[PDB]
Amino acid sequence: GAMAPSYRVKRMDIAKNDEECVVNAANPRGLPGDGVCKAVYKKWPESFKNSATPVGTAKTVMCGTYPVIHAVGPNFSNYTESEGDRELAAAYREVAKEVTRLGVNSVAIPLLSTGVYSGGKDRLTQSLNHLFTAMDSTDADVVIYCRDKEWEKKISEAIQMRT
Ligand SMILES: Cc1nsc(N(C)CC(N)=O)c1C#N
Ligand SMILES: [Cl-]
Ligand SMILES: [Cl-]
Ligand SMILES: [Cl-]
Numbered sequence: 001g002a003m004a005p006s007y008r009v010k011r012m013d014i015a016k017n018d019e020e021c022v023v024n025a026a027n028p029r030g031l032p033g034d035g036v037c038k039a040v041y042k043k044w045p046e047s048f049k050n051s052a053t054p055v056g057t058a059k060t061v062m063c064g065t066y067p068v069i070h071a072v073g074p075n076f077s078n079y080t081e082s083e084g085d086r087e088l089a090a091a092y093r094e095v096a097k098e099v100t101r102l103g104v105n106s107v108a109i110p111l112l113s114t115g116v117y118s119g120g121k122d123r124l125t126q127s128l129n130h131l132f133t134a135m136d137s138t139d140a141d142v143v144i145y146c147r148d149k150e151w152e153k154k155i156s157e158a159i160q161m162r163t
Contacts (some may be wrong), residue, residue, distance in 0.1 A: 001139030002105050007132075007159045011152040015043040015144035023095055025110045025117075026070035028055055035143075036110045044068050055079075056090035060098050069098045073112030073127075076119030077146055088113050088127065092134035099140050106141040111155075130157030132162075 005151065013021060014036055023045070025036040030051035032041040042046060047068035048136075053059035058071040073085035091112050099107050111127040128144075135142050146152055 001131065002141040005139045005141060007033045007135075007142045007144065009144045009146065009152055009155040009159060010128070011146055011149065013039055013134065014108050014110055015039040017143065019106040019108040019141070019143055020104035021026060021067040021069060021099070021102060021107050023058075023069045023071050023107060023109040024051075025112055025115070026053070026059075026072050028072050028096060029053060029071070035115045038066065040152070054161070056065060056087040056094070058094035058098050067098075067102050067104070069095055069102075069107075071112055072094045073117055073144065075117040076121065079115075084119075085126065088123075089130045093154065096134040096138050099135070099138050104125055104140055106143065108143050108145055109135075109147050111151075124151055 019098055024040040027033045030048050031092055044063035047063040049061055051061050051070045053070060053072055055072050055074050058069050060067050060069045071091045073091050074084040074085045114127050137147050144155055146155060
């Protein structure tokens with residue numbers, strides 16, 4: 001565990017993280033995909049061996065000794081708001097299980113279902129609150145990765161609110 005488990009946010013490519021493992025915003029089929037998933041495919045392509053897993057689950061595949069946790073959020077284009085919310089909560093609970101099992105002191109994590117799976121809605125708060133519900137009971141240092149300057153500010157403010 002970390003000495004003093006913390007949450008932090010950085011605005012940069014999650015493929016350049018400084019943590020002991022990474023969460024991929026995966027598709028259910030283990031395909032290279034777009035956005036975070038394509039950056040992860042370029043950096044750790046060996047981690048996509050038998051990475052296919054259903055919506056609301058996470059599957060870890062090693063790239064050398066570096067763990068890639070493939071977490072499959074719902075695509076809100078296909079799910080109802082209600083069923084989507086349930087699956088998004090479940091994906092983060094499975095990430096917390098994997099992070100615990102691996103015994104890492106730190107993890108790099110994107111906000112699941114906030115990009116092309118958002119169904120065209122702003123889901124910063126929804127996705128971040130499910131991340132907190134899952135990860136609050138773990139002792140890994142969590143570093144959240146985003147691209148948007150305004151999202152960096154809102155994520156930072158939400159972390160600071162609880163401290
Ligand atoms: C943190 C992060 N790493 S890679 C990435 N891409 C390529 C998607 C994008 N929005 O540019 C993000 C995000 N978010
Ligand atoms: Cl970058
Ligand atoms: Cl997404
Ligand atoms: Cl973003």
